Coordinates of C-alpha atoms in Angstrom, one line a residue:
Chain E
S1 CA 70.9 120.2 11.1
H2 CA 69.9 124.5 11.5
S3 CA 71.6 128.1 11.8
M4 CA 71.6 131.1 11.8
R5 CA 73.8 133.7 9.5
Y6 CA 75.1 137.6 9.3
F7 CA 77.0 138.7 6.8
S8 CA 78.0 142.6 7.3
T9 CA 80.0 144.7 4.6
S10 CA 81.6 147.6 4.9
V11 CA 82.9 149.9 2.1
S12 CA 85.0 153.4 2.3
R13 CA 84.6 156.2 -0.7
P14 CA 87.2 158.9 -0.1
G15 CA 85.7 162.1 -0.2
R16 CA 81.7 161.2 -0.7
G17 CA 81.2 160.9 2.3
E18 CA 81.4 158.2 5.2
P19 CA 81.1 154.7 4.5
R20 CA 78.7 152.7 3.2
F21 CA 77.3 149.8 5.6
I22 CA 74.7 146.6 5.0
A23 CA 74.0 144.1 6.6
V24 CA 71.7 141.2 6.3
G25 CA 70.9 138.0 8.5
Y26 CA 69.8 134.2 7.7
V27 CA 67.7 131.5 8.3
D28 CA 69.4 128.0 6.5
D29 CA 68.8 129.7 3.3
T30 CA 66.0 132.0 3.8
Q31 CA 66.5 136.0 4.6
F32 CA 64.7 137.5 7.3
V33 CA 66.1 141.1 8.2
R34 CA 68.8 143.8 6.4
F35 CA 69.5 146.8 6.9
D36 CA 71.7 149.9 5.0
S37 CA 73.1 152.9 5.3
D38 CA 72.2 154.5 2.6
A39 CA 68.4 153.9 2.9
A40 CA 66.4 157.7 4.2
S41 CA 65.4 156.8 7.3
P42 CA 68.2 154.0 9.0
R43 CA 66.5 150.7 10.0
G44 CA 66.1 147.6 10.5
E45 CA 64.3 146.3 8.0
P46 CA 62.2 142.3 8.6
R47 CA 62.2 140.6 5.3
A48 CA 60.5 137.3 7.0
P49 CA 56.9 136.8 8.6
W50 CA 57.9 135.6 11.0
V51 CA 60.1 138.4 12.6
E52 CA 57.4 140.7 11.9
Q53 CA 55.3 140.5 14.7
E54 CA 58.2 141.6 17.3
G55 CA 57.6 144.6 18.9
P56 CA 59.0 148.0 18.5
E57 CA 61.0 147.4 21.1
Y58 CA 63.0 144.5 19.6
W59 CA 63.8 146.2 16.2
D60 CA 64.5 149.4 18.7
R61 CA 67.2 147.6 19.4
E62 CA 68.0 145.9 16.3
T63 CA 68.2 149.3 14.9
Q64 CA 69.8 150.8 17.7
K65 CA 73.3 148.0 16.8
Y66 CA 72.8 148.2 13.1
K67 CA 74.2 151.7 13.4
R68 CA 76.5 150.9 16.5
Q69 CA 78.5 148.0 14.0
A70 CA 78.6 151.5 10.9
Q71 CA 80.4 153.3 13.5
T72 CA 83.0 150.8 14.5
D73 CA 83.4 149.8 11.1
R74 CA 84.6 152.9 10.7
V75 CA 86.8 153.5 12.7
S76 CA 88.5 150.3 12.2
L77 CA 88.8 151.1 8.1
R78 CA 91.3 154.5 9.1
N79 CA 93.1 152.0 11.9
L80 CA 93.5 149.3 9.4
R81 CA 94.9 152.4 6.3
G82 CA 97.4 152.6 9.0
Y83 CA 98.8 149.2 9.9
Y84 CA 99.6 148.6 5.9
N85 CA 100.9 152.4 5.4
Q86 CA 98.3 152.8 2.6
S87 CA 97.3 156.4 1.2
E88 CA 94.2 158.1 2.0
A89 CA 92.4 158.4 -1.3
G90 CA 91.8 154.4 -2.2
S91 CA 88.7 152.6 -1.8
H92 CA 89.0 149.7 0.8
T93 CA 86.8 146.9 2.1
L94 CA 85.7 145.3 5.5
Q95 CA 83.9 141.8 5.3
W96 CA 82.5 140.6 8.4
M97 CA 80.8 137.3 9.2
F98 CA 79.2 135.1 11.9
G99 CA 76.7 132.8 12.6
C100 CA 75.7 129.9 15.0
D101 CA 75.2 125.7 14.4
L102 CA 72.6 123.5 15.4
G103 CA 72.7 119.8 15.5
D104 CA 71.4 117.2 19.3
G105 CA 69.6 120.3 19.9
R106 CA 72.8 123.4 20.9
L107 CA 75.3 124.4 19.6
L108 CA 77.8 122.0 16.9
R109 CA 80.0 125.4 16.5
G110 CA 80.0 129.0 16.2
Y111 CA 82.0 131.3 14.1
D112 CA 83.4 134.9 13.9
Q113 CA 85.8 136.3 10.8
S114 CA 86.8 139.5 9.2
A115 CA 88.5 139.6 5.9
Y116 CA 89.9 143.2 4.4
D117 CA 90.2 144.1 0.8
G118 CA 88.5 140.6 0.3
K119 CA 91.6 138.6 2.1
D120 CA 91.9 136.8 5.2
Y121 CA 92.7 139.1 8.4
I122 CA 91.6 137.7 11.9
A123 CA 89.5 135.0 13.4
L124 CA 88.2 133.3 15.9
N125 CA 89.0 129.9 16.3
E126 CA 87.1 126.4 16.9
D127 CA 87.1 126.8 20.3
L128 CA 86.0 130.5 20.4
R129 CA 88.7 131.3 23.3
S130 CA 91.9 132.2 20.7
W131 CA 92.5 134.0 18.1
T132 CA 94.2 133.3 14.2
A133 CA 95.7 136.4 12.6
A134 CA 96.9 136.5 8.9
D135 CA 99.9 139.3 9.4
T136 CA 102.1 140.9 11.7
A137 CA 99.0 144.1 10.7
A138 CA 96.8 141.8 12.3
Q139 CA 99.0 140.4 15.0
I140 CA 98.5 144.1 16.3
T141 CA 94.3 143.6 16.6
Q142 CA 94.9 141.0 18.3
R143 CA 97.4 141.6 21.6
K144 CA 94.1 144.3 21.4
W145 CA 91.6 142.0 21.7
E146 CA 93.1 140.2 24.4
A147 CA 93.6 143.0 26.4
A148 CA 89.9 143.9 25.7
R149 CA 88.7 139.7 27.0
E150 CA 86.9 140.4 23.5
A151 CA 87.0 136.6 23.2
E152 CA 85.1 135.8 25.8
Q153 CA 82.0 137.9 24.9
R154 CA 81.9 136.1 21.6
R155 CA 81.8 132.4 22.7
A156 CA 78.9 134.2 25.3
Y157 CA 76.9 135.1 22.8
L158 CA 77.7 132.2 20.4
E159 CA 76.7 129.9 22.8
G160 CA 74.0 131.3 24.7
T161 CA 71.9 134.2 22.2
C162 CA 73.0 132.7 19.4
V163 CA 71.3 129.2 19.6
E164 CA 68.7 130.5 22.1
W165 CA 66.6 133.2 19.0
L166 CA 67.8 130.5 15.9
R167 CA 65.0 127.8 18.2
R168 CA 63.1 131.6 19.0
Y169 CA 62.5 131.6 15.4
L170 CA 62.1 128.4 14.1
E171 CA 59.6 127.6 16.6
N172 CA 57.6 131.4 15.3
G173 CA 58.0 130.2 11.1
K174 CA 58.7 126.3 11.3
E175 CA 55.2 126.1 9.3
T176 CA 58.0 126.9 6.3
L177 CA 61.5 126.6 7.1
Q178 CA 60.8 123.1 8.8
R179 CA 58.7 122.0 6.1
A180 CA 60.7 121.3 2.7
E181 CA 59.0 122.3 -0.9
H182 CA 60.1 120.0 -3.1
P183 CA 61.2 120.1 -6.9
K184 CA 58.7 120.5 -10.2
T185 CA 60.7 118.1 -12.5
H186 CA 60.0 117.5 -16.4
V187 CA 62.6 116.6 -18.6
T188 CA 63.4 117.9 -22.6
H189 CA 64.3 117.4 -25.8
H190 CA 67.0 119.7 -28.4
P191 CA 68.1 117.9 -31.3
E192 CA 72.6 113.2 -31.7
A193 CA 70.3 114.9 -29.2
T194 CA 70.5 117.2 -25.9
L195 CA 68.7 115.8 -23.1
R196 CA 67.9 118.6 -20.1
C197 CA 66.7 117.5 -16.7
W198 CA 64.7 120.7 -14.6
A199 CA 63.8 120.8 -11.4
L200 CA 62.4 124.0 -10.0
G201 CA 60.6 125.7 -6.6
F202 CA 62.3 123.8 -4.7
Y203 CA 63.5 124.9 -1.3
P204 CA 66.3 124.1 0.7
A205 CA 68.9 124.8 -2.4
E206 CA 70.6 121.7 -1.1
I207 CA 69.9 119.1 -4.2
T208 CA 71.8 116.1 -6.3
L209 CA 70.9 115.7 -10.5
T210 CA 71.9 112.7 -11.9
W211 CA 72.0 111.1 -15.5
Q212 CA 71.9 107.3 -16.3
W213 CA 72.4 104.7 -18.9
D214 CA 71.0 101.2 -17.1
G215 CA 72.5 101.7 -14.2
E216 CA 74.7 103.9 -15.0
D217 CA 76.0 107.4 -13.8
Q218 CA 76.9 109.5 -16.6
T219 CA 78.9 111.5 -15.0
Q220 CA 81.8 112.2 -17.2
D221 CA 79.6 114.8 -19.8
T222 CA 77.0 115.6 -17.8
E223 CA 76.7 120.0 -18.0
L224 CA 75.8 120.8 -15.2
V225 CA 74.2 125.2 -13.7
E226 CA 75.1 126.1 -10.7
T227 CA 72.1 126.4 -8.2
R228 CA 70.3 129.8 -8.6
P229 CA 68.3 131.7 -6.6
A230 CA 64.6 131.8 -8.2
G231 CA 63.4 135.5 -6.6
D232 CA 61.3 133.9 -4.5
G233 CA 62.6 131.9 -1.6
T234 CA 62.7 129.2 -4.3
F235 CA 66.1 127.6 -6.2
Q236 CA 66.4 126.1 -10.1
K237 CA 68.9 123.3 -10.8
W238 CA 69.2 121.9 -14.4
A239 CA 72.0 119.1 -16.0
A240 CA 71.8 118.1 -19.3
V241 CA 73.5 115.3 -21.8
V242 CA 74.3 115.1 -24.7
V243 CA 73.1 111.1 -26.7
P244 CA 72.8 109.4 -29.8
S245 CA 69.3 110.0 -31.4
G246 CA 67.1 106.9 -31.2
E247 CA 68.6 105.6 -28.1
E248 CA 66.8 108.8 -25.4
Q249 CA 64.6 106.2 -23.5
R250 CA 67.4 103.9 -22.3
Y251 CA 68.7 107.0 -20.4
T252 CA 67.0 108.4 -16.7
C253 CA 66.9 111.2 -14.9
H254 CA 67.5 110.7 -10.5
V255 CA 66.9 113.2 -8.3
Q256 CA 67.3 113.2 -4.3
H257 CA 65.6 116.0 -2.4
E258 CA 64.5 116.6 1.1
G259 CA 61.3 117.4 -0.1
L260 CA 60.3 114.0 -1.9
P261 CA 59.5 110.7 0.6
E262 CA 61.5 108.9 -1.8
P263 CA 64.2 110.0 -4.9
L264 CA 62.9 109.6 -7.8
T265 CA 63.5 108.5 -11.5
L266 CA 62.7 111.0 -15.5
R267 CA 62.0 109.7 -18.3
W268 CA 61.2 111.7 -21.7
Chain J
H1 CA 94.8 188.5 18.0
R2 CA 95.7 187.5 21.6
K3 CA 95.3 183.6 22.1
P4 CA 93.2 181.8 24.0
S5 CA 93.0 179.7 26.8
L6 CA 91.3 176.0 27.3
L7 CA 90.5 173.6 30.1
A8 CA 88.5 171.0 30.7
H9 CA 86.2 169.9 32.7
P10 CA 86.0 167.3 35.3
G11 CA 89.8 166.7 33.0
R12 CA 91.3 164.8 30.4
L13 CA 90.7 161.7 30.8
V14 CA 87.3 160.8 29.6
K15 CA 86.0 157.0 30.5
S16 CA 84.3 155.6 27.7
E17 CA 81.4 156.3 27.0
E18 CA 81.0 159.9 29.1
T19 CA 81.6 163.5 28.6
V20 CA 83.8 166.2 29.0
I21 CA 83.7 170.5 28.4
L22 CA 86.1 171.6 27.3
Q23 CA 85.8 174.8 27.6
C24 CA 87.5 177.8 25.4
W25 CA 87.6 181.6 27.6
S26 CA 89.6 184.9 26.8
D27 CA 89.4 188.9 28.2
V28 CA 88.9 189.6 25.1
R29 CA 85.6 189.5 23.4
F30 CA 85.4 187.3 21.1
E31 CA 81.8 187.3 18.6
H32 CA 82.9 183.3 17.7
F33 CA 85.2 180.5 19.2
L34 CA 86.4 177.7 16.8
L35 CA 87.2 174.1 17.9
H36 CA 89.7 172.0 16.1
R37 CA 90.9 168.1 16.7
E38 CA 94.0 167.1 14.9
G39 CA 93.9 163.0 15.4
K40 CA 92.7 160.7 13.3
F41 CA 89.8 161.8 12.4
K42 CA 89.3 165.8 11.8
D43 CA 86.8 168.5 13.0
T44 CA 86.3 171.9 13.9
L45 CA 83.0 173.2 15.8
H46 CA 82.3 175.8 16.4
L47 CA 80.0 178.3 19.2
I48 CA 79.0 181.8 19.7
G49 CA 80.1 183.2 22.0
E50 CA 79.1 183.9 25.6
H51 CA 80.1 186.9 27.9
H52 CA 78.1 186.7 30.9
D53 CA 80.1 187.7 34.4
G54 CA 83.2 188.9 33.7
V55 CA 84.9 187.0 30.8
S56 CA 84.1 185.7 27.7
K57 CA 83.6 182.0 27.2
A58 CA 82.2 178.4 25.6
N59 CA 81.7 175.4 25.9
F60 CA 82.0 173.1 24.3
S61 CA 80.4 169.0 24.7
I62 CA 82.5 166.2 23.8
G63 CA 80.6 163.8 23.9
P64 CA 79.5 160.0 24.8
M65 CA 83.1 159.4 24.7
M66 CA 84.9 157.7 21.7
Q67 CA 88.4 156.7 20.2
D68 CA 87.1 158.9 16.7
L69 CA 87.2 162.1 19.2
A70 CA 90.3 161.8 21.6
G71 CA 92.9 163.7 19.9
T72 CA 95.2 167.1 20.6
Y73 CA 93.1 170.2 20.6
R74 CA 92.9 173.4 20.0
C75 CA 90.9 176.6 19.9
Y76 CA 90.7 180.2 18.8
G77 CA 88.9 183.6 19.0
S78 CA 87.5 184.8 16.0
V79 CA 87.6 188.6 15.9
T80 CA 84.7 189.0 13.3
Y81 CA 86.6 185.3 9.3
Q82 CA 89.6 186.0 11.4
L83 CA 90.7 184.4 13.9
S84 CA 93.8 185.0 16.7
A85 CA 97.2 183.3 18.0
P86 CA 96.4 179.2 19.0
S87 CA 95.5 178.0 22.3
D88 CA 98.3 176.4 24.8
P89 CA 97.5 172.6 23.2
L90 CA 95.2 170.0 25.4
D91 CA 96.1 166.0 25.7
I92 CA 91.9 164.4 25.6
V93 CA 92.1 160.5 26.4
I94 CA 89.3 157.8 26.5
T95 CA 90.0 155.3 29.3
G96 CA 88.5 151.6 30.5
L97 CA 89.3 150.1 27.0
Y98 CA 91.8 147.6 28.1
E99 CA 92.2 146.2 31.8
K100 CA 93.8 147.5 34.3
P101 CA 97.4 146.7 35.2
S102 CA 98.7 146.3 39.1
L103 CA 100.1 149.1 40.5
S104 CA 103.1 148.8 43.3
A105 CA 105.5 150.1 44.9
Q106 CA 109.2 149.1 45.7
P107 CA 109.9 149.7 49.2
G108 CA 106.6 149.6 50.6
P109 CA 103.7 152.2 50.2
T110 CA 104.7 153.6 53.8
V111 CA 107.4 155.4 53.4
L112 CA 110.3 157.9 56.1
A113 CA 110.9 161.0 55.2
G114 CA 113.6 161.7 53.3
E115 CA 113.7 157.9 51.8
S116 CA 113.6 157.3 48.1
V117 CA 110.5 154.8 46.4
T118 CA 109.8 153.8 43.2
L119 CA 106.5 152.6 42.0
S120 CA 106.2 150.0 39.0
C121 CA 103.6 149.4 36.9
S122 CA 103.3 145.6 35.9
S123 CA 100.3 143.5 33.7
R124 CA 100.4 140.1 31.3
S125 CA 98.7 142.4 28.5
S126 CA 101.5 143.9 25.6
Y127 CA 101.4 147.5 26.4
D128 CA 103.9 148.7 25.3
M129 CA 104.3 151.9 27.2
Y130 CA 102.4 153.0 30.9
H131 CA 100.6 156.5 32.3
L132 CA 101.4 157.6 36.1
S133 CA 98.8 159.9 37.7
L134 CA 98.6 161.8 40.6
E135 CA 101.8 162.7 35.0
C136 CA 103.9 161.1 33.5
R137 CA 105.0 158.5 30.4
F138 CA 108.0 156.2 30.1
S139 CA 108.5 153.2 27.3
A140 CA 107.2 149.6 28.5
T141 CA 104.5 140.3 32.6
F142 CA 105.1 144.1 30.9
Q143 CA 106.3 146.5 33.7
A144 CA 107.8 150.5 33.3
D145 CA 109.3 151.6 37.1
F146 CA 108.6 154.9 38.2
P147 CA 111.4 156.6 41.0
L148 CA 109.9 159.2 43.0
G149 CA 113.3 160.4 45.0
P150 CA 113.6 161.3 49.0
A151 CA 109.7 160.9 49.9
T152 CA 107.8 165.1 51.2
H153 CA 104.6 164.5 50.0
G154 CA 102.1 161.1 49.7
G155 CA 99.0 161.0 48.0
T156 CA 97.5 158.9 45.7
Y157 CA 98.3 157.2 41.8
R158 CA 97.3 154.9 39.5
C159 CA 98.5 153.5 36.3
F160 CA 97.3 153.2 32.9
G161 CA 98.8 151.4 29.8
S162 CA 98.1 151.8 26.5
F163 CA 99.6 151.0 23.0
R164 CA 102.3 152.1 20.7
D165 CA 99.9 153.4 17.1
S166 CA 97.1 155.0 19.8
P167 CA 98.5 156.8 22.2
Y168 CA 94.6 158.4 23.1
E169 CA 93.2 155.4 24.2
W170 CA 94.3 153.6 27.5
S171 CA 93.5 150.8 29.5
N172 CA 90.8 150.6 32.7
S173 CA 92.4 152.4 35.6
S174 CA 94.9 150.2 37.9
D175 CA 93.6 150.2 41.6
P176 CA 94.8 153.9 43.4
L177 CA 97.7 153.2 45.5
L178 CA 97.4 155.5 48.6
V179 CA 101.6 156.4 50.1
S180 CA 101.8 158.0 53.4
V181 CA 104.6 159.4 54.5
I182 CA 106.0 159.8 58.3
Chain P
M1 CA 94.0 143.6 -2.3
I2 CA 92.3 141.0 -4.6
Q3 CA 90.3 140.4 -7.4
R4 CA 87.9 138.4 -8.6
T5 CA 85.3 138.6 -12.4
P6 CA 81.1 137.6 -12.1
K7 CA 79.4 135.0 -13.1
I8 CA 76.7 135.8 -14.9
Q9 CA 73.4 133.5 -15.8
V10 CA 70.0 135.1 -17.3
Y11 CA 66.7 133.1 -17.0
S12 CA 62.9 134.1 -16.2
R13 CA 61.2 132.7 -13.1
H14 CA 59.0 130.4 -14.7
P15 CA 59.1 128.1 -17.2
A16 CA 58.4 131.0 -20.5
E17 CA 55.7 131.1 -22.3
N18 CA 55.0 134.6 -24.7
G19 CA 51.9 136.6 -23.6
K20 CA 52.0 135.3 -20.2
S21 CA 53.3 138.2 -17.5
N22 CA 57.0 136.1 -15.9
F23 CA 59.6 138.2 -14.7
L24 CA 63.2 138.3 -15.3
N25 CA 66.4 137.6 -13.9
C26 CA 70.5 138.3 -13.6
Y27 CA 72.2 136.6 -10.6
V28 CA 75.9 138.2 -10.5
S29 CA 77.8 135.8 -8.6
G30 CA 81.8 135.4 -7.8
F31 CA 83.0 139.1 -8.1
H32 CA 85.0 141.4 -5.9
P33 CA 85.3 143.9 -5.2
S34 CA 80.8 145.0 -4.9
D35 CA 80.9 148.0 -7.5
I36 CA 79.1 146.6 -10.5
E37 CA 76.7 147.9 -12.9
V38 CA 74.1 145.3 -13.8
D39 CA 71.8 146.6 -16.7
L40 CA 68.6 144.6 -18.7
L41 CA 67.9 144.9 -21.8
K42 CA 64.6 144.7 -24.4
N43 CA 65.7 144.3 -27.9
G44 CA 69.0 146.9 -26.9
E45 CA 67.9 148.9 -24.6
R46 CA 67.7 149.8 -21.8
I47 CA 65.1 148.9 -19.0
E48 CA 63.9 151.3 -15.6
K49 CA 62.1 149.8 -13.7
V50 CA 64.9 147.1 -12.2
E51 CA 64.9 146.3 -8.4
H52 CA 68.1 143.8 -6.5
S53 CA 68.3 142.1 -4.5
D54 CA 70.7 143.3 -0.9
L55 CA 74.2 142.7 -1.1
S56 CA 75.5 139.1 0.7
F57 CA 79.1 137.0 0.2
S58 CA 79.8 133.6 0.5
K59 CA 82.9 131.6 1.6
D60 CA 85.4 132.5 -0.1
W61 CA 84.9 136.5 0.7
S62 CA 83.2 136.8 -2.9
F63 CA 79.4 138.5 -3.6
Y64 CA 76.6 137.8 -4.9
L65 CA 72.9 140.3 -6.7
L66 CA 69.9 139.9 -8.0
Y67 CA 68.7 141.7 -10.9
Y68 CA 64.9 141.8 -12.0
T69 CA 62.2 143.4 -13.5
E70 CA 58.5 142.1 -14.5
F71 CA 58.3 141.3 -18.6
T72 CA 55.9 140.1 -21.0
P73 CA 57.8 137.4 -23.5
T74 CA 57.0 137.7 -26.9
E75 CA 58.2 136.7 -30.2
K76 CA 61.8 138.0 -31.6
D77 CA 61.5 140.3 -28.3
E78 CA 65.3 139.9 -26.7
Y79 CA 66.9 140.3 -24.0
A80 CA 70.6 139.8 -22.4
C81 CA 72.0 141.0 -19.7
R82 CA 75.0 143.6 -19.3
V83 CA 77.6 143.9 -17.0
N84 CA 80.5 146.0 -16.1
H85 CA 83.3 145.5 -13.5
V86 CA 86.6 146.7 -12.9
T87 CA 88.2 143.4 -13.8
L88 CA 86.6 143.2 -17.5
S89 CA 88.2 145.7 -20.3
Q90 CA 84.7 146.3 -22.0
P91 CA 81.6 145.6 -21.0
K92 CA 80.0 142.1 -21.2
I93 CA 76.4 141.0 -22.7
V94 CA 74.4 138.4 -22.5
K95 CA 71.4 137.3 -23.6
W96 CA 68.3 134.9 -22.6
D97 CA 68.0 131.9 -23.6
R98 CA 64.6 130.3 -22.8
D99 CA 65.8 126.9 -23.0
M100 CA 68.5 127.1 -20.4
Chain C
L1 CA 69.3 138.8 17.0
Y2 CA 72.6 140.9 15.7
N3 CA 76.0 141.6 17.2
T4 CA 78.2 144.9 17.6
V5 CA 82.1 144.1 18.9
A6 CA 85.4 146.4 19.5
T7 CA 87.1 147.5 16.9
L8 CA 90.3 146.6 15.0

């Protein structure tokens, strides 16, 4: 159930020069590439080991495509300002996201959509041949892209190029991309008292934490934080509960994760 | 001072990602030339003057063609800055960004002298206006009709489509249509 | 034009234990636009060798970033995260709690 | 592998 995803952002700064462009790429939960237009020598930079040995031809072609897209965004930002009758003084944001999902081993579904100032603008439909415009301004873009046969080009990338290279990355980095890392767990006691179940250093980010009581889920009184990055490629999460001081040994924490042979059960 | 002249080599219709020369020239021996563009992205270019072979000129290289380089151009001569009157405006157009329209002749491509002949330009894309070249413009299957009047001297014609909000960005060229008067 | 408030979490990479080298993190997510200023405070004062990740965003188009630095936790040495955003009336400080 | 497309 692997996937490859790209995220691009352009932000305009009237007066302080031409817009800022940043793009990043992921395979599942692992970043592997970045590009920033404000760097001294702007170029595509690897962020995972399994793309570090692709050769200078590969990385020069990627760099040229990034610089082309930043120039394309600069024109689009000027066009959007005209569609919406906006002044030339304010700052505006344009975001773009695309990628492919794999299953039998081929394309499960593709993505390609855009946003302006935080709201939907235009998106490629799941048929990879028609568009969904969000307002009357985006209808101008749809008419231009239909006349340019542009949906044909995005479908060809998503069904061929996206799938081929995702398979290549998954093979060259299969020792880290296809080997899950199990969480390290422990329970802490904080004085009626508080029981906290920890899970640290796991990959991928998908995980489930559940407190119990003689086999009964305790969902009603469970504090739970959002999954957060550890900073080294792994993730953390904890779930807490409050308990009558004395019944601590009646409660159990349960962990479900890809890196465990079978689900875990913990006590304080 | 007097205004200079401005032309494009080989023409003002520039294919996408190609290059064109904008040449300002005069008999006055200007030291510098300025090239100004009005449109989406305004710019101003400067070049030193060249005085060989009986004329004073400067050759501005515009390319590879992108959307931000299309617009209305005017060039100036500098006596020192201290500039002259503006040259006649010149519209530089980028082509090849959309699919080509269809071009047909209502009473036939081969015609008799004195007979009236009308050309038609159609497409399924929602183009807002069409352009004919032997340089007419008519507003918009979306199609516009071009009447040529009584046939005298035929030639070869081409057709382009465009959108109202971006008048310097044209579609691909239609297939050329040869008209013959006999 | 939409705008969203940042969510904040302050924590360490590994379980804290005074006298040992660690990494102190401040994780901001769910905000819009992306213009933001985030500071790591050592006893109320600014640390200057702080790095951060590359800009990215989620399904709802909101951004997320991680700020991190090397540090040594001890006792009675307090740490906090200070962020400012167009959506906040005044800067917001969030203190580090090594039990959370 | 990145991809670059038309303007809006």
